[PDB]
Motif scaffolding. Structure first.
Motif, PDB file in Angstrom:
ATOM      1  N   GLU A 204      45.745  38.445  43.972  1.00  0.00           N
ATOM      2  CA  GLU A 204      45.763  37.516  45.096  1.00  0.00           C
ATOM      3  C   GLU A 204      46.814  37.910  46.124  1.00  0.00           C
ATOM      4  O   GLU A 204      46.578  37.794  47.334  1.00  0.00           O
ATOM      5  CB  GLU A 204      46.004  36.095  44.596  1.00  0.00           C
ATOM      6  CG  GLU A 204      45.935  35.046  45.683  1.00  0.00           C
ATOM      7  CD  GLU A 204      46.603  33.754  45.279  1.00  0.00           C
ATOM      8  OE1 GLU A 204      46.703  33.495  44.065  1.00  0.00           O
ATOM      9  OE2 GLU A 204      47.026  32.995  46.175  1.00  0.00           O
TER      10      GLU A 204
ATOM     11  N   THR B 196      45.372  40.811  48.112  1.00  0.00           N
ATOM     12  CA  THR B 196      44.296  40.358  48.987  1.00  0.00           C
ATOM     13  C   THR B 196      44.848  39.655  50.219  1.00  0.00           C
ATOM     14  O   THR B 196      44.437  39.946  51.347  1.00  0.00           O
ATOM     15  CB  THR B 196      43.351  39.436  48.220  1.00  0.00           C
ATOM     16  OG1 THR B 196      42.724  40.168  47.162  1.00  0.00           O
ATOM     17  CG2 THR B 196      42.282  38.890  49.143  1.00  0.00           C
TER      18      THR B 196
ATOM     19  N   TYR C  75      34.083  38.080  43.980  1.00  0.00           N
ATOM     20  CA  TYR C  75      35.288  37.388  44.410  1.00  0.00           C
ATOM     21  C   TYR C  75      35.159  36.822  45.818  1.00  0.00           C
ATOM     22  O   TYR C  75      36.170  36.661  46.506  1.00  0.00           O
ATOM     23  CB  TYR C  75      36.492  38.327  44.342  1.00  0.00           C
ATOM     24  CG  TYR C  75      36.850  38.801  42.951  1.00  0.00           C
ATOM     25  CD1 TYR C  75      37.544  37.981  42.073  1.00  0.00           C
ATOM     26  CD2 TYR C  75      36.506  40.074  42.522  1.00  0.00           C
ATOM     27  CE1 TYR C  75      37.878  38.414  40.807  1.00  0.00           C
ATOM     28  CE2 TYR C  75      36.838  40.514  41.258  1.00  0.00           C
ATOM     29  CZ  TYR C  75      37.523  39.681  40.406  1.00  0.00           C
ATOM     30  OH  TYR C  75      37.852  40.118  39.146  1.00  0.00           O
TER      31      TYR C  75
ATOM     32  N   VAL D  84      38.356  35.153  47.889  1.00  0.00           N
ATOM     33  CA  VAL D  84      38.832  35.876  49.065  1.00  0.00           C
ATOM     34  C   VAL D  84      38.717  35.000  50.304  1.00  0.00           C
ATOM     35  O   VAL D  84      39.590  35.021  51.178  1.00  0.00           O
ATOM     36  CB  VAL D  84      38.068  37.203  49.226  1.00  0.00           C
ATOM     37  CG1 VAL D  84      38.391  37.844  50.560  1.00  0.00           C
ATOM     38  CG2 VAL D  84      38.416  38.152  48.097  1.00  0.00           C
TER      39      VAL D  84
ATOM     40  N   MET E 245      36.165  44.053  50.606  1.00  0.00           N
ATOM     41  CA  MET E 245      37.196  43.339  49.860  1.00  0.00           C
ATOM     42  C   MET E 245      36.865  43.211  48.381  1.00  0.00           C
ATOM     43  O   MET E 245      37.760  43.375  47.541  1.00  0.00           O
ATOM     44  CB  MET E 245      37.409  41.950  50.453  1.00  0.00           C
ATOM     45  CG  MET E 245      38.253  41.939  51.701  1.00  0.00           C
ATOM     46  SD  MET E 245      39.989  42.193  51.308  1.00  0.00           S
ATOM     47  CE  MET E 245      40.579  42.795  52.876  1.00  0.00           C
ATOM     48  N   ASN E 246      35.609  42.915  48.043  1.00  0.00           N
ATOM     49  CA  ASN E 246      35.228  42.817  46.639  1.00  0.00           C
ATOM     50  C   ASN E 246      35.434  44.145  45.919  1.00  0.00           C
ATOM     51  O   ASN E 246      35.955  44.179  44.796  1.00  0.00           O
ATOM     52  CB  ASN E 246      33.775  42.363  46.534  1.00  0.00           C
ATOM     53  CG  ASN E 246      33.438  41.817  45.171  1.00  0.00           C
ATOM     54  OD1 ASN E 246      34.311  41.654  44.322  1.00  0.00           O
ATOM     55  ND2 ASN E 246      32.160  41.540  44.947  1.00  0.00           N
TER      56      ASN E 246
END
Ligand SMILES: [Zn+2]
Ligand SMILES: [Zn+2]
Lengths: 108, 99, 148, 82, 94, 85, 99, 83, 109, 93
Positions: A46, A49, E8, E12, E33-34
């Motif tokens: 997290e 991200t 995700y 996200v 991103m995944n």
DNA sequence: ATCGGATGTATATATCTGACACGTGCCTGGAGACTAGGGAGTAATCCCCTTGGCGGTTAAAACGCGGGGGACAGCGCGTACGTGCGTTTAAGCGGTGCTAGAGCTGTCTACGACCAATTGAGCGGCCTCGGCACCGGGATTCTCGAT
DNA sequence: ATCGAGAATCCCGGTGCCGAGGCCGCTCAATTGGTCGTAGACAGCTCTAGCACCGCTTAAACGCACGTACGCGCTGTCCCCCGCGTTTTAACCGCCAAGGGGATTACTCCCTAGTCTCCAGGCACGTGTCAGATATATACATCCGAT
């Protein structure tokens, strides 16, 4: 922390802790998996991200857009030293390259 | 009488134009034909998802762009502006692809 | 030192500007243990309801959030049997610049509109969310048992 | 049967790739070298893709096979799943 | 209905709305991103198992993951990620 | 021209500014408070709640966290209060 | 009257001598001291097995030999015979070691 | 017992010998400082991971297997000292 | 085969099959392991070892020696084509380098 | 004490099949052990990934065959596949 | 084009020493027989999406021309690097002594796997409106021949 | 040092469309409760090798002087890429049509894990001898100045 609340909100996270626990417990990594490993791994994921998303959103706003696209993702990643080093052997589809012209080629 | 640009000032314009965009610089049908030809060289009677062809195009274009950056630096090292096959050979040798 | 100096001026600020329908002070010998009283908001089924609460200040302030609890009883998706408050300000998104007046006012703001998304007790949240009109009678009932 | 499709990589296309790479002047002997290196890269990737496809008893080269082949060579690709 | 596939995407998106409340994300960016999250998960959880096979252990704890984070992430990312993980673990326990 | 003592206070300390750090949101706070909040609370500015993680990573390696101009202005005006700490 | 070789032949003689042997060309005590200095810069009061220092020396010497091969190729590419720091920098950049 | 500026122990003749094995016939005078800097960077990169490996196992002695593991992690496998 | 001899001798190998089976089982690779994987892996490992040992023995013979040392292994690996590509990133301790001098550096005729 | 195992005796047996009159030192033996271990790790990891991709929970002989094809270069891979198939065929009967 | 020193490298013989190849005890890991169950093999059905074809329109490619700028060769200067010798330094070797920390054994206690019941978090499918693409016109800014 | 004309790029305003954001239904995977076998954490003891010091050779490092040959700048030539206009080719888009094979489901059987017993293969330790390194003395290849 008090029980009777979901595992992800007990640790203050957003990424799932049950899914990460299952993935660690099913991927042929080790015979046993500790209780605190999913929390640590989800927190790291997290953090990374959010770290990339902040810079991507800034790059998108600098173009007067309100949607993140792979070009903004690569503009964020390749302009940050640690992120660029972490992903240095990785190609982002539809991202292009940074503007960079050698100073010798410019007219004199 | 007609207006002409000096040799070198239209090349930089194209550099700035193509460094500002993200599209694919190779035509899609010829690349797909070449991919199918190589694959049928490997295994006969093959079918391809369109996503596979697109991924191959993206990977090949990224590889060629990086190689041309290294080639440009090699050419600039020898006090030139033009790039020559020896620059590509040296860049590939140092990267370890051909040795 | 640092923490005590912060608490003294927090108390001074609270005293010089008394928050509406909320009062607080020190009940014990020190300023670590405090008591407070909250009055029910006008646009709520908690009319004329007084609620007593006790708070403990951790040894490191304000970098760690204070601990709040309800001595009295109230029914709420964010408050359990013991009286603990389930507020994101209290546990997750706590900012060290936040003062005691802001959190004590956010408690009343939550009392105005319960948050059902992240409830400490699920079944109470279900009862609250299924229909407000049916429960409103029990809401006044709970007020007469303890608040009134 | 397809033959002599390497010439679909035209000189304008190679010039565009060089321009994106930052090249200002280009010699006339660079296009055949670029074609050769591109052919070698394509053969290397497609061999692994077809191997991955054949192991799975399939007859179509999906995008997952290409992604796995690229990752196996140290050229990870983001965007097409995986 | 097709078979359920996991991603995700929602997490996200929650993170994105936490950092940039007025910014959305397209579909290809979400698919990038995944893949990034999957790749980093595999990297950390695979290099943290050699760390246990090396020492003749059989359990992966939060001590293998911390060291994997230290080894894999660069100089300044590995000081913030470790702190965030320790904070999350401490918040989880108590 | 010369700032007064009213604008020379730490929001968390309510004391004199020591080793000031000025975040991109123009929120100035003393260095120990910044260290404590980064270590424990949020990795965000306590005042307007915006993420400053990338800025911190960039400026920690290059040793540019402290605002040199404001610190230079402050340090000469109040030597005694700084000595009391 | 005294005999001396023209500049260049003894260098080739040294090249032929050191490419036929396999020993280590760096003295061992200074390298051990450098390794210990860096390690104590990382963590204090460390102990080193002799095999650890030996492995570090082997790896470092192999790396330097390969880097010097690449540097020699870069120097020759520019119509030279001397190796200069720009050659080392170009080889390192193309290899991706500094980028 | 601190040790200072020991990088001068990689003398100019040693660098010349390394270049001779590498196949270099003529050397510029500014090569030696560049070589020292590159060697220091490489040594720091390897030793950081070696010390991390020895710290995870709660030891105080940096074994050879830690160095081998670090070298394998950085992409330079080494045969001869274990593994 | 006869189902009576040792597993290594039943398959005609010299590398172990029980040890390879155990290593595949305890390595955290897959939940289950087939009964033909260790034999295949042992055969591949033995073939590669035999190839490298043959080349190293030839290199030692060329040097009038009757003992393989790391120098002969380095010569055998580097002088090949597939073995050099299989072991491109591998460093051999006490191996040295292949002797060559660029043609430009050699003295002019 | 404790017992540590290695492929030394099998490497020596293979050497005696190949060159009946040559010997091998200790450093060369350690290098050979490292090489065998490294190739074992490579092939086993590739086979594990192959089995994981196809939603399988077993490493069979075809997993190892595909891993050998992916890792080793052309002629090496061809000869290794031939040798492994021969060994498996001799084992099954 | 050699011819002569002069220097370095190669070649043959004695010898001696320590590491390699072999032998012995044994114990721990591998082999053998048996039982249970779930994983994977095989057959059948669905329908998605891959391949093939046609017509148009037009953006991109192919070809030719005139010329300016860059690649390459040749010359000259001088300065930095190679070779050689005398001197100063600390690496290398051997030997001794000490103890810190790696390594192994025995207890036992708490953490992680396994199993059964249950329900809400998350996935698939639909829907709608606004963010971004596109077109057209004007303002701004490099670019170049001419002074 | 500059002024001006022709051309490329950026801003701004208006229209439209399709995909991203959110809602609804549902099903399966994560949660909670409980039990148990063993992984590893801790304490104690052994003993190996990592660290420190001392003295003696002598090998590699250092500093200095001379010369030369290689790097670097400058000039000249020519020819080969570049910018631009005209014509030709086929890529791209929209559309229709067929069917292969990817994906899912159900049934079953046989291959592999787990358990117990047993015994021999390979690991640690000890020993002898010969392969290679070292010292010594010739023989020949190679380099450089000079004819
Ligand atoms: Zn402060
Ligand atoms: Zn702020």
């Amino acid at each position: 922390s008090a029980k009777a609340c979901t595992r992800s909100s007990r640790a203050g996270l957003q990424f799932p802790v049950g899914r990460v626990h299952r993935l660690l417990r099913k991927g042929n990594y080790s015979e046993r998996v500790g209780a605190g490993a999913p929390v640590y791994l989800a927190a790291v994921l997290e953090y990374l991200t959010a770290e990339i998303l902040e810079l991507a959103g800034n790059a998108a706003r600098d173009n007067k857009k309100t949607r993140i696209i792979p070009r903004h993702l690569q503009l964020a990643i390749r302009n940050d030293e640690e992120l660029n080093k972490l992903l240095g052997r990785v190609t982002i589809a539809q991202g292009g390259v940074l503007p960079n012209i050698q100073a010798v080629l410019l007219p004199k | 009488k007609p207006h002409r640009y000096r040799p070198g000032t239209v090349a930089l314009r194209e550099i700035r134009r193509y460094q500002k965009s993200t599209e694919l610089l190779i035509r899609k049908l010829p690349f797909q034909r070449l991919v199918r030809e190589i694959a049928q060289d490997f295994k006969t009677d093959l079918r391809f998802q369109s996503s596979a062809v697109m991924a191959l195009q993206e990977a090949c274009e990224a590889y060629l762009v990086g190689l041309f950056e290294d080639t440009n630096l090699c050419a600039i090292h020898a006090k030139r502006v033009t790039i020559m096959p020896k620059d590509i050979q040296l860049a590939r040798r140092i990267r370890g692809e051909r040795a | 030192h640092m923490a005590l100096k912060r608490i003294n001026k927090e108390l001074s600020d609270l005293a010089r500007d008394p928050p509406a329908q909320i009062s607080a002070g020190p009940v014990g010998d020190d300023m670590f243990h405090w008591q407070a009283t909250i009055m029910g908001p006008n646009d709520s089924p908690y009319q004329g309801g007084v609620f007593f609460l006790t708070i403990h200040f951790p040894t490191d302030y304000p970098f760690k959030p204070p601990k709040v609890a309800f001595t009295t009883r109230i029914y709420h998706p964010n408050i359990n049997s013991n009286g603990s408050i389930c507020l994101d300000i209290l546990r997750s998104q706590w900012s060290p610049a936040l003062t005691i007046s802001k959190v004590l006012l956010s408690i009343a703001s939550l009392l105005d509109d319960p948050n059902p998304d992240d409830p400490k007790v699920p079944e109470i949240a279900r009862i609250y969310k299924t229909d407000r009109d049916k429960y409103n009678r029990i809401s006044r009932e709970w007020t007469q048992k303890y608040a009134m | 049967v397809l033959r002599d499709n390497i010439q679909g990589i035209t000189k304008p296309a190679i010039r565009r790739l060089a321009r994106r790479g930052g090249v200002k002047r280009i010699s006339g002997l660079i296009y055949e070298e670029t074609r050769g290196v591109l052919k070698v890269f394509l053969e290397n990737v497609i061999r692994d893709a077809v191997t991955y496809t054949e192991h799975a008893k399939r007859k179509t080269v999906t995008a997952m096979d290409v992604v796995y082949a690229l990752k196996r060579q140290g050229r990870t690709l983001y965007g097409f799943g995986g | 209905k097709r078979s359920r596939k996991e991603s995700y995407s929602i997490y996200v998106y929650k993170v994105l709305k936490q950092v940039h409340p007025d910014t959305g994300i397209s579909s290809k960016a979400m698919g990038i991103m995944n893949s990034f999250v999957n790749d980093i998960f595999e990297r950390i959880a695979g290099e943290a198992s050699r760390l246990a096979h090396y020492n003749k252990r059989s359990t992966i704890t939060s001590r293998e993951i911390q060291t994997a984070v230290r080894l894999l992430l660069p100089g300044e990312l590995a000081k913030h990620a470790v702190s965030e993980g320790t904070k999350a673990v401490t918040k989880y326990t108590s | 021209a010369i700032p007064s003592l009213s604008e020379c206070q730490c929001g968390i300390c309510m004391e004199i500014l020591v080793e000031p750090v000025t975040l991109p949101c123009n929120h100035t706070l003393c260095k120990p408070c910044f260290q404590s909040t980064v270590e424990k609370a949020s990795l965000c500015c306590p005042f307007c709640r915006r993420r400053v993680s990338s800025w911190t990573r960039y400026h920690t390696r290059r040793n540019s966290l402290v605002n040199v101009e404001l610190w230079t202005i402050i340090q000469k005006h109040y030597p005694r209060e700084c000595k009391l700490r």
